[PDB]
């Protein structure tokens, strides 16, 4: 993810709701396991330590993500997800079908 970053409000919410202090651990099949067997499996190589845990849940429907910015050639700030992009949209696909009995 380069077009976006973690929002500061979500980071603060995760910080002092203390969700990182209540991690859950999973094995290679994604089944919940205690930290002791997670450590055992990671040491023996039967678990990938990277993608095998979760940071509980942040309460409150907060947006996880904000747009990330960059510098233009003018030295101005600009969102990374906006720009020249491309140009191919056509108009639509008008499929006629002026006979369907539309229910009220």
């Amino acid at each position: 993810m380069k077009n976006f970053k973690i929002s500061s409000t979500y980071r603060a919410a995760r910080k002092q709701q203390k969700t990182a202090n209540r991690k859950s651990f999973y094995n290679d099949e994604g089944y919940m396991i205690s930290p002791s067997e997670w450590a055992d499996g990671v040491i023996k190589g039967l678990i990938n330590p990277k993608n095998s845990w979760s940071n509980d849940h942040v309460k409150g429907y907060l947006p996880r993500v904000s747009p990330r910015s960059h510098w233009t050639k003018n030295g101005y700030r600009e969102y990374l997800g906006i720009g020249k992009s491309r140009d191919i949209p056509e108009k639509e696909p008008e499929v006629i079908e002026m006979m369907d009995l539309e229910l009220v």
Partner: protein, 49 residues
Amino acid sequence: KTKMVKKGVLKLTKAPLKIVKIPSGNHSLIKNHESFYEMGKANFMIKEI
């Protein structure tokens, strides 16, 4: 690991936008410009032939 949180997520596939020339106007199939169909949806009309 793939925990179901609350009632879950909405399944929204991507397929090209199509507009039907129904005899009421021009009805676009979706209400979003990111081309998001509700995967698995259909409509039906049942008659007694």
